[PDB]
Design an enzyme around this catalytic site. Structure first.
Site, short mmCIF file in Angstrom:
data_model
loop_
_atom_site.label_atom_id
_atom_site.label_comp_id
_atom_site.label_asym_id
_atom_site.label_seq_id
_atom_site.Cartn_x
_atom_site.Cartn_y
_atom_site.Cartn_z
CB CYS A 18 32.90 37.29 40.74
SG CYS A 18 34.70 37.54 40.64
CG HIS A 72 33.60 42.15 37.13
ND1 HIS A 72 33.91 42.36 38.45
CD2 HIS A 72 33.58 40.83 36.96
CE1 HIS A 72 34.04 41.20 39.06
NE2 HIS A 72 33.86 40.26 38.17
N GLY A 94 34.29 32.05 38.62
CA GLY A 94 32.87 31.79 38.77
C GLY A 94 32.40 32.22 40.15
#
Ligand SMILES: *[C@](O)(C(=O)N1CC(F)(F)C1)[C@H](C[C@@H]1CCCNC1=O)NC(=O)[C@@H]1[C@@H]2[C@H](CN1C(=O)[C@@H](NC(=O)C(F)(F)F)C(C)(C)C)C2(C)C
Ligand SMILES: *[C@](O)(C(=O)N1CC(F)(F)C1)[C@H](C[C@@H]1CCCNC1=O)NC(=O)[C@@H]1[C@@H]2[C@H](CN1C(=O)[C@@H](NC(=O)C(F)(F)F)C(C)(C)C)C2(C)C
Ligand SMILES: [Cl-]
EC number: 3.4.19.12
Lengths: 306, 306
Positions: free
Chosen positions: A145, A41, A143
């Site tokens: 991820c 993503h 942030g």
């Protein structure tokens, strides 16, 4: 003496962390050899994430659309592919700091260290358990991820978790390094909830052995039980069933302390039925289920990593 | 979301750990530039440690009596000197992995990360607080001496602790990197006990702000107090006095949540007097005092290190 929630030393993983930017979305990537692994993503806008078509967004991207930075160094992407929920970016530079490593899918109940990162930089490190409901109880801000979870065996990093999302109740879900989620979650912004969690019985017993080893022995009763009676009483308290495998796993601690596993089971049964009555075990007022037998052994036997 | 006891990433320190052997005593050393720092009782036998004369034992040692290993590399000692309770071994090789660094003596109440080592190798990492009684609640086995505590500011490692000993109740004492103990301890095997500890009030308040930030808000009452009334009530529960400095330090969290410090103080007073009545805050059934305001900010604002 002492007993702390202890993470693995993070240095081997730190040298693998990069920043990945695509459009306006920036998160963290894992740079091993000449591949950067990150959540897929990264290729979405906010808008997109409510119901994204990942293979569609990715077909519209070219190599140059992915900015990969390792400090003040940009790495040129020369290839890209999607594996499940993880994006693989081939880069023109192999990471010189790549450790010896594996990708492992861990089991419910097993622990690992999370190296929490923002913008490809480490914020800190802490231990987690993969919960029976396939969540972890983490600390992750926007942030984070692409932050990864790992175990170290001696010299070898076993990567088992990559962070993707946060569910209601502030618990966390992600994937193994082949991009398959733990549990039933999907990488889209829609209503998802964790299943009702359970307590990891084998781990609580491991922690009771840790207590004994540290001299905290008040909860030891004079009784024994059968695995049968124990499992019936524990089911009421939302404890996982203890298996014979779990009993065998606990053998080292049992042998070290001279307390049979089914005696400890009797002690735990009494704690569950009677509560702790104002007392603590190892500093704690609640029973702890995020130490595995191996963790207890490592910490109480001083296993190290090279 | 989420709130975990999080250590600093350890990689910068890992690259500084060596094994120091003298006679049959082996512990850990810290290799910075061309100096290895270790506890000075590396030069004792078991026997010696009941009442050692350190300057006498050291005068009888020559450079070659100290075996310093960094992996499968021996570093030749070319000089040695004692600074308080810390031994400095000059080596013929500067550590190429020396980070930017300082030696700091921290204050009671301040936290740090401990990188627990055996035989110069890292076992794991966890956060500690320097307790008001100048102990830490660690996890240290025999072999752990020379393990260090540190903070990272961005790129700079502030070394604040070197581990020396374990006191009754399984708590730990050591020195700053200039070899001065925290608290009244001495590096000899004789009866010493920690002073009665106190709870670090400013840290508990920081943790209450962390809870609010995470949505755990049940304990917030509608009241305020004076710093006066708060300090009187808290003294009864073995809480440190809260100072105006502590109030000013809490300003960022207070401003972020819109809860005045003296309102939070009113909420805490109610918890102390009434207990938690079966409830948890941030997973916890006891009040936590091992997060500083800065720790809370770092974790809840995602400060990172390069
Ligand atoms: C991760 O994508 C990330 O850190 N970043 C930086 C960026 F904004 F560029 C992308 C975040 C990490 C989250 C953010 C909230 C705090 N903690 C976290 O772990 N992941 C996400 O934001 C993911 C991606 C979309 C939605 N989402 C969520 O975590 C959402 N969860 C859910 O929808 C639910 F199903 F409930 F779990 C959110 C509501 C918490 C934002 C993806 C693709 C799932
Ligand atoms: C440290 O010296 C060490 O790890 N090693 C490896 C070695 F054996 F070669 C030296 C240990 C670490 C201790 C060991 C017990 C478990 N946890 C620890 O932190 N430090 C010591 O052993 C120190 C040195 C002599 C005695 N001691 C103690 O810790 C003792 N404490 C006390 O006497 C008391 F005052 F109570 F605190 C002990 C009884 C715990 C052994 C020194 C020089 C103080
Ligand atoms: Cl608790």
């Amino acid at each position: 003496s002492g007993f702390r929630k202890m993470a693995f030393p993070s240095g081997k993983v730190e040298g693998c962390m990069v920043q990945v930017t695509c459009g306006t979305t920036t998160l963290n990537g894992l740079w091993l050899d000449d591949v950067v692994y990150c959540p897929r993503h990264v290729i979405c806008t906010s808008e997109d994430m409510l119901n994204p078509n990942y293979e569609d967004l990715l077909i519209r991207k070219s190599n140059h659309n992915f900015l990969v930075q390792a400090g003040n160094v940009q790495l040129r992407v020369i290839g890209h592919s999607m594996q499940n929920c993880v994006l693989k970016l081939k880069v023109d530079t192999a990471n010189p700091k790549t450790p010896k490593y594996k990708f492992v899918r861990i089991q419910p109940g097993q622990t690992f260290s999370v190296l929490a990162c923002y913008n490809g930089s480490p914020s800190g490190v802490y231990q987690c358990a993969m919960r029976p409901n396939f969540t972890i109880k983490g600390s992750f801000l926007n942030g984070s991820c692409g932050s990864v979870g790992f175990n170290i065996d001696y010299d070898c990093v076993s990567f088992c978790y990559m962070h993707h999302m946060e569910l209601p109740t502030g618990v966390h879900a992600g994937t193994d390094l082949e991009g398959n989620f733990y549990g039933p979650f999907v990488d889209r912004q829609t209503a998802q909830a964790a299943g009702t969690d359970t307590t990891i019985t084998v781990n609580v017993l491991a922690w009771l052995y840790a207590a004994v080893i540290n001299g905290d022995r008040w909860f030891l009763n004079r009784f024994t039980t059968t695995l049968n009676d124990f499992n019936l009483v524990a089911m009421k308290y939302n404890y996982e069933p203890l298996t014979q495998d779990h009993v065998d796993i606990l053998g080292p601690l049992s042998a070290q302390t001279g307390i049979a596993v089914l005696d400890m089971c009797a002690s735990l049964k009494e704690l569950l039925q009677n509560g702790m009555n104002g007392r603590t075990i190892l500093g704690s007022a609640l029973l702890e289920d995020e130490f595995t037998p191996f963790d207890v052994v490592r910490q109480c036997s001083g296993v190290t990593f090279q």
